[PDB]
């Protein structure tokens, strides 16, 4: 149920990692492959510790092995975008998140941060904030949820939500390690909780401003994968990991602006929600790397989920597509939550779509090519 | 499966290694055996920590047990050549790389450093630089790749290159330990990445000047073997560990001179590449410890490899024998990469051949005795 | 394969060993039993740390349980002879090597240090030096070499001598722990190496002066047994642990005097060798605890060994009974090596026999009763 | 990977089964559940061995437990249709295949034999003959193909088709037992062969005339499931059990009547095919129990398969929708093969659709509701 | 080490196989695939037991899945050639060996029986007799010889040849079962013996006359594969399964005509030997399915064999290319043995080459056309 790599003597590894490093510094470059969901990484040595992301040199990789280029001119370029402390190697080593460009310096097909960044710069003075709740399931190497009975099922749902105990919470060690690792690296992690299905969990990122939301979520996803690799388990973001009467996995998004956060900001919240009601199909396509196919298995109108093809909004309503928190409604200010995006969504796509519809008043089935 | 030695209680060993050492210092002598691929080692005690390699005493070993000498005159001599810090015993213990000489003080058959050093001193003013990318595969004690299904195969290639996750990268603990050990010892390690084959990895050494490149690669190979011994796995440099549609293993070499690195040095790069195009058969024989038989199983013109019988060169071409990086071509200066050498090549043999053809303008099938 | 005691939780033991000791000091007494090969030990508490071996009190043990005494008068006496730091309990605890005397204060049958010490004092002005190479094999609790295939054999010899790798060296953890323990205790250990047969190793002790050589070897043997006990394996000194085409185990002895070590000392080396050629049968009996029967299984004239019936000497000859190193012959000074003694020899017997023949010019088959 | 029931001592059961039955006769009733592809069985005791199916008494069962009815009129009825000798209990025990009728004596939703029997009685003068090649995959209790590596894949396809050997044929014990059982029971089984991917097999039923063909295939499916129960494995009829470069499963149907079986009947084959070319979509709907949502994963136009959206025909063309054997073309008489129906097809639906289009000259989208 | 199919309850299968067959008869069709080394099989049902092979109808198969045809004309044909009793299903079921023809009724590339049958019909009066000693090695599913220690080797050779005992003969159950099955089926099997290395055996077929030799050997190979499938082991015909000091596998051929079988026929043997002397390279090419790339690893001139590039002959000389039995020389009448062909040789190729060189006096490196 666990990988063979996880059965190696981990005490041996800790002895080697206790050696003083010296002067040289390791940097790990991370980018998104051609599937729109996978992550890749590799390491290089630097002569001295960088102080800002702009001191890091550019790099390259063979795009033919990642299904991002074919034939000749298969080389692609990595341009650093964000820098974080490395929790797996400690200071002064760093983690670098990069953008992907093809050989003629054009952005890659899966490079969505390029367009999103320019959109955020246009509405900078309004200070948009984002908060995302990421759900996932821990799986064994055999393709079944971690800790589940062999070729069987655990008891019915109800005691696993925010549960405590050996028979109610599976794999809390991964969650605790991931929480501590994110804090060390500088990722703005807000909290965690156990989900309805056993071995299902969730963590929250935010509130983050502008383009920083997409960077923080992707790095948090990488840390989860790397941490799970140490324990020998697999973390999946599939919207419906288990068929039948079991909870799905989504990525709820919280959105707010400076006007929304001020006194009597509830008026602006309702205007934004009204605009969102006119572009249901546009956002469904944007909330999924496959165009909406993955989210169809989850948004069936059951298990506290909204219908895929219907739009609804309400205060303190967890069955609608858009939910206004009861506290926000009473104080006439705050934020609102979008419950449509799936667990495997791209944060750069989700954040950009919200800004276009609500702040730029875009209309139609296609984004505007130039500004606005 | 792993070795029985790896199942011993490693916590017991750490208790003994925590004892203060005292005044005596341990030195490990390392040399190359008669096969041209294997490494041998043994330890002696010194009264005080040596400051330079010049003050290490000479030693000897029985050559009849290593297939390097006859019966009557079996003694061979070890002459220290380089010193490094010992990462397995910590300071002040040392690792010593030595040359092998026969009983009549003549160089051994596999002692290729003696001739390479003299060639290096001939062009010392031009400051040649070398960079080598060494690939390898992690193997279980049962003769099958580590982490692979028993009597089976993993999924098709494509998600393993620079992959992250329990189902995408096998044996990262060895790689992490090896990287830290090389940094502590003083080996000029440049970076690592996961390869197309699962359980296949690669590390880069350089840029190194002259004879230092050969010394640094051999010590890096020794550290990999010693580290893998702790975990109970086997590291192989075989060019084609597994037959079929699986990636091979090579040792790419990057070469540059002082003239090449300066402005408009691309003209010198073209001159060297032109010279290399005339001595294809000479370099193929030199790029393999068996005269080229091993590299025949890998260089078949498939899986981003060049043909064994044909010579080709190009800029940003990963299917040719010689590749010019696109960045180098744009800046009109830099280096070029030779993709012919196999994974089990001798670095002393490879570096010497490049200098002879490109800098000493040698012509023919035999090296020139004395001078160039 | 490994003992049941080795499967206990070793982390539990370290917690207890971390408790501060206090004022009392533990002392472990070690002696040789009636078989002439076995070692025994027990511990007592002392009120304060002793500074010299002469401060240690005498002790006693029941000789009927060690096959050394009669029925009615079973008590034997332990007289401390040498003191060392305890590597298993750390400072200020000590290890004590003792001599055995009968109830009437006469030396025991296996007590050979008593006569050897008096012989040593007779030639103290010549400063004899000794160096011994102890070979041994690591065995599992099932009676087979450690790491060997169950009911099978590994590959043919040749890659195991001074080998590195998971498939070439078995049980290096024991060797590393033993090396550090000897250094901490103060035993003059000179170096180690892997032997021809897999799971066979060797360590060197010396150069030691006079009676101190026998004390250091016996304590080194005790530390090896105690270290192997922690890992759950057995170390055997049997001359021929495995029948067939597998390497034997011996104890080569290096001998020199202050005259041999000075300039033109090679002349003195030859004279000693000629004297040794006259008493071949006398030394064969003295080199084995059983009278020569054990060494008969090893010294068969093959596997770089000399024949048990014939005496031969030569320079740089590993097939002769006496070997002169090539370096010694060139510099006309140094030492010579005796390759006859078996791996289970008593160092006190071996050192005494060399002095009697070479320095006291003794002749005949019996030692001289009083002095020389 | 195998069921716990299969680990019981089968020798004990054989002792009981050898007891003389006496005079009573056991009868097993078999019917199709509400899913349209599952089977249910029940056993009753008869006073004497029946000589024909016409004298077997009717029975009943609870439709609520079988999801063929709600909680008000859950009771259903079973009417015997065919009788066969029992291979699992031997003579004189028998197997009975029955039709399902509602409480109001109307055929159930999944009872397709009622309408099919009426249709083929109309064209009984032409004597239509049918032959279907049924494919299936053997799977363990863990949901993985039987004999496959744990969490892995076997070698690439090519040696498994009609293979022999421990590494080429998986689970030949089941197919041999099923073949012998079908012959004993009286099912018109024609032959078996191993398929392209390992653990996949195929058997052929026919040439069966009239409504008997639908009866024979359903009984053959029941015997396969019952036989696999003894060995503890699961037989599945999914069209695409394993995604990727692995062969799918289908049910090729061979059709002919007296016209094509006579001389120069090749023209009768041609006119029937050209009629089938018009109603491509209609037959696709009726060839799948789910309307075509299952066969879409198999008919992808690769691995020697025809595209689901394209109709084609040809002589000895295995990539077309309809295949005419080369022998049939050269002999100008015989039959034609339909490669469209999936493995989990209903035999009654498949035979009925072929009769309507090719013999009754029907057209449109809905079947012709009345008799004439 | 054994297949998962072999762990199924074989008692269950025996219960089903004991059911009376009835009246139908099963026939198994066997043919050689495109590799020229493997075999393929499938089963059909017959309405009655055929008295002779001439009553068996023709059949067909998909050549694309067998690697014998492309996708355009993948269909191939099977023509029965010989019939044998089925030992795995008992009477009246049959095994049939069939020839393979293309769609245009031409022999396939691997169909060497067609031309072989024509050649042997031209020397019918001489009545050539053949006897081949076929050697093979039993292997586990992990690629290691059956019964060998895991990741290890057994003792040195010498006791395993024709040995008896649990430690000397590995897998005699397969040998005994195969011997009994061959006798039941009608294969002219002459005897068996254990070979030099463990888990290696040999059986002898003959003396068969004419084309009968090729049919019997191929059927015997099929029975061996089928029998080994029941036990879960793999039979290998590789000439050198294990490199090193382990014996190889070959197929010695014994040849004689009526002239050599008459009085003073030793001279006729001698004329045949000298005719075989000047066509050594031609026969070596035809004695291997790959032209000699396999037999080169066995005929190294060691382990009592002959060199690949040298021709030799002699009486009772087992190290020569051709051996004449001492008893044959003593009686001046008999046969001669060819020790050149490898274990994986094609009997049709071997018999044809011997006939056309010794009895038809062919010369050159190419076989004669219709002229011979
Ligand atoms: N003003 C704000 N603007 C944007 N995001 C905000 C704001 N205030 C809080 N958030 C974010 O909203 C998220 C709240 O997630 P939380 O898990 O508490 O939701 P919840 O209401 O319990 O919903 P659910 O039932 O979906 O889990 C956090 O990520 C937080 O950072
Ligand atoms: N001027 C130089 N001269 C010589 N070697 C250099 C020089 N600059 C860099 N190198 C070396 O070249 C190597 C760069 O190879 P690296 O593996 O990073 O990339 P790559 O060749 O594109 O990758 P791959 O061939 O594995 O796809 C490093 O070992 C580096 O030290
Ligand atoms: N002058 C000396 N007098 C006595 N002993 C000495 C002297 N110099 C060195 N020695 C000892 O001789 C031994 C050297 O043996 P070592 O195992 O290093 O080499 P070796 O005899 O060539 O090895 P092997 O026989 O295993 O091939 C050491 O124990 C060392 O202490
Ligand atoms: N005249 C006929 N009318 C109807 N069915 C027939 C007739 N003759 C034979 N059949 C049936 O056709 C089927 C032939 O199946 P078989 O496996 O031999 O086909 P195939 O041509 O090799 O196809 P495939 O390669 O798709 O498996 C059998 O079920 C057989 O009973
Ligand atoms: N007159 C004959 N003509 C042809 N073949 C014959 C004749 N007599 C015997 N044979 C065949 O020769 C073969 C003899 O093989 P056998 O293994 O007994 O011989 P061998 O010389 O002892 O073998 P090996 O080379 O293994 O030592 C048998 O297959 C037998 O049928
Ligand atoms: N150990 C010695 O050399 C002398 C010891 C001395 N008797 C003491 O006071 O301990
Ligand atoms: Mg939440
Ligand atoms: Mg929420
Ligand atoms: Mg590289
Ligand atoms: Mg490279
Ligand atoms: Mg030594
Ligand atoms: Mg020695
Ligand atoms: Mg078929
Ligand atoms: Mg078919
Ligand atoms: Mg024989
Ligand atoms: Mg023979």
Author numbering:
A (entry chain D), B (entry chain E), C (entry chain A), D (entry chain H), E (entry chain G): 2 to 373
Give excerpts from the publication.
Glutamine synthetase (GS) is an ancient enzyme that catalyzes the ATP-dependent condensation of glutamate and ammonia to glutamine. Here, we demonstrate that human glutamine synthetase (GS) can reversibly polymerize into filaments aided by a composite binding site formed at the filament interface by the product, glutamine. The glutamate/ammonia binding site is gated by a flexible loop that bears two key catalytic residues: R299, which interacts with glutamate substrate carboxyl group, and E305, which is predicted to deprotonate ammonium ions to ammonia, enabling the required nucleophilic attack of the y-glutamyl phosphate intermediate. We propose that GS filament formation constitutes a negative-feedback mechanism, directly linking product concentration to the structural and functional remodeling of the enzyme.
We performed an additional cryoEM experiment with increased GS concentration (1.5 mg/mL), to bias our particle populations towards filamentous assemblies, and vitrified at 57s, a reaction time that should yield a high concentration of product due to the higher enzyme concentration than previous experiments. The resulting 3D reconstruction of the 2-decameric species had an FSC 0.143 of 2.2Å. Inspection of the ‘filament assembly’ interface between the two decamers revealed a discrete density that was absent from the apo-filament reconstruction. The density is too small for a nucleotide (ATP or ADP) and too large for inorganic phosphate. Given the association with product formation, we modeled glutamine into this density in a conformation consistent with forming hydrogen bonds that link the filament interface residues and the bound product. The two-fold symmetry at this interface and the averaging inherent in our data processing results in density that likely reflects contributions from glutamine in two orientations. Taken together, these data support a model wherein glutamine synthetase filamentation generates a composite binding site for glutamine at the filament interface, which is located over 10Å from the active site. By contrast, the filament map collected during turnover displayed almost no density in the region, which is indicative of a greater degree of disorder. However, the turnover-filament model displays distended loop conformations diverged from the active-closed state that we turn collectively as the ‘open ensemble’ of loop conformations. The E305-loop (residues 299 – 311) sampled a more diverse ensemble (with root mean square fluctuation values of greater than 10Å) in the turnover filament state, with the turnover decamer and apo-filament displaying reduced variability.
